[PDB]
Structure 1
Amino acid sequence: QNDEVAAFCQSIMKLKTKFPYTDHCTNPGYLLSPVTVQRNMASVKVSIEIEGLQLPVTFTCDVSSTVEIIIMQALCWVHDDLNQVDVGSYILKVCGQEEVLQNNHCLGSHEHIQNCRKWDTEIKLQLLTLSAMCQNLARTAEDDEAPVDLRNIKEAWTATEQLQFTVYAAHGISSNWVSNYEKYYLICSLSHNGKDLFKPIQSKKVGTYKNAAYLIKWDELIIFPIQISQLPLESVLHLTLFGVLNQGPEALGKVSLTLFDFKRFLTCGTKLAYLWTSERIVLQVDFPSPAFDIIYTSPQIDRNIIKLETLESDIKGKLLDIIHRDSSFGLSKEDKVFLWENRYYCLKHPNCLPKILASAPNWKWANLAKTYSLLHQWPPLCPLAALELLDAKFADQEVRSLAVSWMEAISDDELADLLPQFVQALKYEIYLNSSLVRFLLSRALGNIQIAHSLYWLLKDALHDTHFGSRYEHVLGALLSVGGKGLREELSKQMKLVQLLGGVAEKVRQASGSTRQVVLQKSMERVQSFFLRNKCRLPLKPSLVAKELNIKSCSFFSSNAMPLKVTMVNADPLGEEINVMFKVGEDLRQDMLALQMIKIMDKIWLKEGLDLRMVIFRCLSTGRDRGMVELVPASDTLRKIQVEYGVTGSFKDKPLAEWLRKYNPSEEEYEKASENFIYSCAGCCVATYVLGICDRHNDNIMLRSTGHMFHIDFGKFLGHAQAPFVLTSDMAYVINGGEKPTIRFQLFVDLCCQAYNLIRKQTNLFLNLLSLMIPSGLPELTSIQDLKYVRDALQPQTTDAEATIFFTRLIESSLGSIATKFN
């Protein structure tokens, strides 16, 4: 471990050398404003503050214009000719947010622009030079030159010795264990590619040793029916410790051991493993210790150039049927062998390589040379497709390194929203230094948003009972390489989340009349914090808070008593910061639901379908606590139904009247109704595919602009289970009347269109969810959960039949009032 850590640190300094503090492109010192490229790149109004002008210039821009020419248009308003105006010295930033628009991207591609348009709120930018932009987070020269802190040989293929090891003892047993358990045993399993190579082997059941209740001694030899020369390089031994009660046996802990170390040497001699149960226990397994070191050597390369082969059409039809399948999921055994034999015909369809590798008959050393030979004459995959190659089922390091090399094509903006799965895929790298971790660290060096999100994600990952140590090394590398500016900023944000969490705990423990007073008094400590510190908001680190608005702070009087934290912007050009902080309930599953909704939205927008979706932020900042974006001027459907229900008996006019009071004019009410149509279509498709069937008056929320969204994702992937529901007031808003109109047909067409656009990306959604399996969410625990989503996506069906299917889902959701529609 120490020597692996040292080699890791050497490599990481080598990675640092490639990001000097002088290069502004990779060391900007500011956040980049996020972008999601949208097709068909319509006009909007933008107001731009300019130095020397008392009023900002306001003018109409083409949504499809790049930020560069928009800067020049703003410069043209103030100068008659740009001959001696330093045009390249200028940037645009969002008013009140320390994020900079990206020059080479369309104004319409930027998320801030897109939200403002959905919102119809003022686009308020500011023109300045790089010199005036805050670059406090930038790395110094100091940081660059600082160090990072966190005899004979036998080739393995010639090694005939059985794999064998002696499970010797476990040291450190607790008093609670001695009282509750008589005896103990280990179950030993041997795995590669996340799959058992053989039946697991169970040890004898022994009690605590004589005159030692902290010691469990087995001194037992365990032999597996395999030789050293048959072990894949990435073979892992799993030891799970069990306790049989004295008064079913229950699992006390688990350790894993790689059979080869990061330098290809076979594990030899005594080896100590550590398992935690809350405390640390030490297992000792003794491996054989011959007079020679055994090293793994990969088979030697095949050089081949493979256009020159048979053809046929009974076979070629079946083959292209396999290639265009949704995924490798559920691929039958016959299909696997058929594809494997025909694999060299597939070379002009790169994104089917994961199917091909999943159809390999085995990963025996002898069969590796022909796989490797294929892999290095294979075309580049698209990054999203290469995700599958980083899942558990592909442990081979050539495969994974090659997948990371294909991943390098992905943009930072796309990668930012996929980081959770990458952090999880770290668990399938057996060694500390890997292509993948260096890729992630490299991206975090060149982009502050990626570094910030990686920070918070690794910080959750630390609570893993099995992988926490590895994540500590990775997080220490991120913090080391990030520089002192970023480090002190993250420290301020960490202290802020701790202080806010303390306030929330005190508020919940307090009750009734002594609760808001407890709030106000407990916020004193955070007020002190701001008195000595200006702090970036962890949810959106481009917002700088200087002070707490103690007056507007309150609680929501709901389950888990959430805090409404109101903060003063440090920028006068910006507006208040309002975030909810919540303690008690686990926000990671809400984060996964939100991320899936965001990815569906991205997919739609890339195909030119804008369903006007509400995409709000949520950040787990610890064990069962975090902070959540607050969508302004929105209320739950029941709240609307009942506040209307005191004045009316109409059954179906509450939502329409609610929207009418905030959109009185006819143009404004039609616009709000249209927003409702589109956002509701998006919500229905998401409800069905992601299996969120807990929808009810309290779960669905509606914004005064007319946009509908979800806020609670308690039953997520609950496909056990009218998938969604369309009560009559929603139908009234969509129709505009009490009878069906062409607006309902537009809603049905929008739903089916979006549904098919997601069915086309079934592989991405299956891969994005399986990569989250090992994160430990209660109800994404197996590949079976993925099967339910795939069945919902109906992969085999055509787009036309899928349209028919979803249309009848809609009319099922309409219930009794579905008689009135065609």
Structure 2
Amino acid sequence: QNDEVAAFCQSIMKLKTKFPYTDHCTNPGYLLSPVTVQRNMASVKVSIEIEGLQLPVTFTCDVSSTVEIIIMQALCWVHDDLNQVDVGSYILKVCGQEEVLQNNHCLGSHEHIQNCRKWDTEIKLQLLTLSAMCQNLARTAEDDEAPVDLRNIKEAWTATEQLQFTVYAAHGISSNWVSNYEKYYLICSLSHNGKDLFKPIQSKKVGTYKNAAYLIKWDELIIFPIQISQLPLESVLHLTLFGVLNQGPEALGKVSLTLFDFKRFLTCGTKLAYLWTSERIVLQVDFPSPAFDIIYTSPQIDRNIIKLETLESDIKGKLLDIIHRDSSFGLSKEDKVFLWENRYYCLKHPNCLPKILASAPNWKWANLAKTYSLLHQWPPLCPLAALELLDAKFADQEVRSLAVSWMEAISDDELADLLPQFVQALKYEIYLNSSLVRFLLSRALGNIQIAHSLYWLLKDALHDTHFGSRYEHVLGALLSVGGKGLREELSKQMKLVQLLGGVAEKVRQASGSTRQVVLQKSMERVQSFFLRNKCRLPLKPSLVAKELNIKSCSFFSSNAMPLKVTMVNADPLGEEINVMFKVGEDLRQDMLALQMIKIMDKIWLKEGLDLRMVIFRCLSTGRDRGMVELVPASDTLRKIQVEYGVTGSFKDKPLAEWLRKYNPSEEEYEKASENFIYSCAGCCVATYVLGICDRHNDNIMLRSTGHMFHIDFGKFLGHAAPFVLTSDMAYVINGGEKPTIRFQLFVDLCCQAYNLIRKQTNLFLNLLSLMIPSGLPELTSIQDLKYVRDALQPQTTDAEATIFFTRLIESSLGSIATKFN
């Protein structure tokens, strides 16, 4: 490993040379305000603070205007002609946030702008020079110049020797194990493309060695029915150890060994594998040690230029029908063989290549040359299509290297929200240095939001017992390549987390009578933290916390007694920072739900549909702890049904008369009811496809502006009414007791949104598949994907699916449904 780690480090030094501290482009030292590209890009009021004016300039801008001309519009408000001012020196930042608007994007493209439009809040920007902008994260000269720290040959295709090895012993057995388990046995599996090449082979069952209670010795020769010549390069040996109790056999751990190392030489001699439990056991497997090294050599390059062949009508449609099929998922043995033989007819449909490689007969060394020949003349995939080619199913380095090269197309703003899936895809790279990890590190270098998100994702990946060692090295490389400025702020953030994690444990372990006092006392350590530190908020590092507002800090009076942490902004131009910190629940299930809901919002906005969706952030800092964004001026349905329940018992009125008290005027209420119609549609569609079946009045939330959203994603991909519309919901939508065209608008929005997710079925299956190895309780295998596919009714028309969802809505309405048509 020491050799692979050395070459990785020499590769990363070479990567840093492409990102000098001089280039402001890739080394800005500030976060970029995120953008999601929205169609038809309406006007807005923006408020810009200018250097030397007592009040900010407040004017109307076209949402379609680039930030560049917005900056200049703002300069025209103080300057007559702009031949005296250097406009290229100026930037716009969000007020209270170390975030810079991207010049060449529409004002309306920016996440912050469309959030302000949703809530109807003042758009407050600040105009200033690059010179004036906080750049305390930027890489220095020191950073670039600093290092990075975290005899004969026989070609394999000629090697006819049987793959065999001796499973010798495991050393360092616990006192715990000697009591429980009588004998132990290994189950040896050979795998490539995430699938077993043969039946797994079981070791003999042996106890601890005579006069040695810490050592199990098998000294057993395992022989597979395969030759080194038949081994794919990315072939992996898996050894799962089992303890048979004395007084079913029990899985104690698993090691993986790559039969070829990162230099393509076959594993030879004694190799040591470390499997963890809580404690470190050492497994010794002895490989043959011939007089000669064996090296894997790919087949010689096959140069061909294929395009006019036999064109037959009937089968041309059965190919087109398969090409245009929703996804590769569940494709029959016959459809694979048919597509495979017609693969060279599919060169004007790039995004189907994953279906072609999934329909390969095998990955035998002989047949690789003609697969490689296809790939290198194949047209570039769209980045989201190529995600599939980084999954378990495709181990081949040429396939994955191409998949990454096509991915270079993707924007930083699109990549930002896809990172969790990319981090998990590292588990399908057998080698440490790889096209993928270099892509991720390179994107983090050139963008601070990506580096920041990678840090927290990689820190969450460490806790994996099998892949913890791999992620340790990748995090190390990120932190090293990040520079001093970044590392120090990340350390500050990591400290604030541990302290808040500390306070929340202390708060919960306290009694009901003393809990409030324990919080007030426990917050002394974070009080002290801030006296010697200004710290960026981990959930949104554009927000700088200067001080803690101790009198506003509280516990939410729920199980898990979550903290409400109120913090003062280091920017007077900014607002207070309110955020939840919770301990006990694993938040990663919630993070995925929110990710999937956020990608649906992005898909809809890319086709002109805005369903006014509430998109809040959730960060898993440690195992079973993290920060959750607090949406202001919102309450659970139940709290509202309960608070109106005291005045009247009409039951149609609670939501309606709740929205009126905050939206009193006729145009104010109508808008809030419209916000509800659009937000409810998105929520209904998201509820059904993602299979969040466990919704109730404490689960559903409602913002005072009328926007509806989910919060507790306890149930996910439920399998076994999908959503529920109550009378009070129907009342707000209709605007009265009887059905209106507003309910027809609601029905159209649902069905339209539903169809736009169906056209992206493959993306949603790829995004959930890549989160299988992350070990979430409700997502362990491809069968969990089938539900979601089955919900999206593939190979049915938009018109056929509109009737299916319309009947889901009518079904949801319950007994009131009879009143509607």
Q: TM-score range by the shorter chain?
A: over 0.9
- By how many angstroms is 1:308 displaced? 2.0
Query: Helix, strand or coil for the counterpart of 1:632?
Result: coil
CA contact (8 A) 2:635 2:703 kept: yes
Q: Aligned partners of 1:649, 1:215: CA distance in 2, in Å?
A: 72
Query: Helix, strand or coil for the counterpart of 1:78?
Result: coil
CA displacement 1:21-46 (0-9 Å, x = unmatched): 00000000000000000001100000
CA contact (8 A) 2:307 2:344 kept: no
CA displacement 1:232-289 (0-9 Å, x = unmatched): 0000000000000001000000000000000000000000000000110000000000
Q: Aligned partners of 1:495, 1:87: CA distance in 2, in Å?
A: 40
Name stretches of at least 5 consecutive residues in structure 2 with no aligned partner. Answer: none
CA displacement 1:674-709 (0-9 Å, x = unmatched): 000000000000000000001101100000000000
Q: Aligned partners of 2:439, 2:55: CA distance in 1, in Å?
A: 45
Q: Aligned partners of 1:301, 1:534: CA distance in 2, in Å?
A: 57
Give 1:384-403 correspondences, 5 Å limit. 384-403=384-403
Q: Aligned partners of 2:434, 2:191: CA distance in 1, in Å?
A: 20
CA displacement 1:383-432 (0-9 Å, x = unmatched): 00000000000000000000000000000000000000000000000000
Q: Aligned partners of 2:317, 2:249: CA distance in 1, in Å?
A: 53
Give 1:525-544 correspondences, 5 Å limit. 525-544=525-544
Q: Aligned partners of 1:480, 1:719: CA distance in 2, in Å?
A: 44
CA displacement 1:478-530 (0-9 Å, x = unmatched): 00000000000000000000000000000000011100100000000000000
Give 1:365-376 correspondences, 5 Å limit. 365-376=365-376
Q: Aligned partners of 2:633, 2:47: CA distance in 1, in Å?
A: 24
Q: Aligned partners of 1:409, 1:436: CA distance in 2, in Å?
A: 14
Q: Aligned partners of 1:580, 1:505: CA distance in 2, in Å?
A: 14
- By how many angstroms is 1:559 displaced? 1.1
User: Which deviates the most, 643-652 or 609-618?
Assistant: 643-652
Q: Aligned partners of 1:278, 1:407: CA distance in 2, in Å?
A: 38
Q: Aligned partners of 1:226, 1:314: CA distance in 2, in Å?
A: 42
CA displacement 1:86-124 (0-9 Å, x = unmatched): 010000000000010000000000000000000000000
CA RMSD across the alignment: 0.3
CA contact (8 A) 2:252 2:277 kept: yes
Name stretches of at least 5 consecutive residues in structure 1 with no aligned partner. Answer: none
Q: Aligned partners of 1:525, 1:258: CA distance in 2, in Å?
A: 47
- By how many angstroms is 1:172 displaced? 0.3
Q: Aligned partners of 1:120, 1:511: CA distance in 2, in Å?
A: 42
CA displacement 1:758-783 (0-9 Å, x = unmatched): 00000000000000000000010010
CA displacement 1:110-166 (0-9 Å, x = unmatched): 000000000000000000000000000000000000000010000000000000000
Give 1:303-322 correspondences, 5 Å limit. 303-322=303-322
Q: Which residue of the partner structure matches residue 792 of structure 2?
A: 793
- By how many angstroms is 1:719 displaced? 1.6
CA contact (8 A) 2:613 2:709 kept: yes
- By how many angstroms is 1:812 displaced? 0.1
Query: Helix, strand or coil for the counterpart of 1:810?
Result: helix
- By how many angstroms is 1:663 displaced? 0.2
Q: Which residue of the partner structure matches residue 818 of structure 1?
A: 817
Query: Helix, strand or coil for the counterpart of 1:232?
Result: coil
Q: Which residue of the partner structure matches residue 340 of structure 1?
A: 340
CA displacement 1:523-579 (0-9 Å, x = unmatched): 000000000000000000000000000000000010100000000000000000000
Q: Aligned partners of 1:520, 1:606: CA distance in 2, in Å?
A: 47
Q: Aligned partners of 1:441, 1:183: CA distance in 2, in Å?
A: 45
Q: Which residue of the partner structure matches residue 491 of structure 2?
A: 491
- By how many angstroms is 1:307 displaced? 2.0
Q: Aligned partners of 1:24, 1:167: CA distance in 2, in Å?
A: 55
Q: Aligned partners of 2:45, 2:184: CA distance in 1, in Å?
A: 72
Q: Aligned partners of 2:719, 2:60: CA distance in 1, in Å?
A: 47
Q: Aligned partners of 2:256, 2:694: CA distance in 1, in Å?
A: 39
Q: Aligned partners of 2:698, 2:809: CA distance in 1, in Å?
A: 21
CA contact (8 A) 2:91 2:128 kept: yes
Q: Aligned partners of 1:429, 1:307: CA distance in 2, in Å?
A: 34
Q: What TM-score does the superposition give when structure 1 sets the normalisation length?
A: 1.00
| Large movers: runs of 4+ above 6 Å | none
Query: Helix, strand or coil for the counterpart of 1:739?
Result: coil
- By how many angstroms is 1:340 displaced? 0.0
- By how many angstroms is 1:651 displaced? 1.5
Query: Helix, strand or coil for the counterpart of 1:775?
Result: coil
Report percent identity of matched pairs: 100
Q: What TM-score does the superposition give when structure 2 sets the normalisation length?
A: 1.00
Q: Which residue of the partner structure matches residue 35 of structure 1?
A: 35
CA displacement 1:2-33 (0-9 Å, x = unmatched): 00000000000000000000000000000000
Q: Aligned partners of 1:642, 1:569: CA distance in 2, in Å?
A: 35
Q: Aligned partners of 1:219, 1:469: CA distance in 2, in Å?
A: 27
Q: Aligned partners of 1:559, 1:66: CA distance in 2, in Å?
A: 47
CA contact (8 A) 2:183 2:206 kept: yes
Q: Aligned partners of 1:440, 1:307: CA distance in 2, in Å?
A: 36
Query: Helix, strand or coil for the counterpart of 1:257?
Result: strand
- By how many angstroms is 1:649 displaced? 1.2
Q: Aligned partners of 2:512, 2:410: CA distance in 1, in Å?
A: 52
Q: Aligned partners of 1:516, 1:818: CA distance in 2, in Å?
A: 48
Q: Aligned partners of 1:512, 1:11: CA distance in 2, in Å?
A: 56
Query: Helix, strand or coil for the counterpart of 1:173?
Result: coil
Q: Aligned partners of 2:697, 2:539: CA distance in 1, in Å?
A: 27
- By how many angstroms is 1:313 displaced? 1.2
Q: How many pairs align?
A: 821
Q: Aligned partners of 2:649, 2:139: CA distance in 1, in Å?
A: 64
Q: Aligned partners of 1:732, 1:348: CA distance in 2, in Å?
A: 51
CA displacement 1:734-778 (0-9 Å, x = unmatched): 000000000000000000000000000000000000000000000
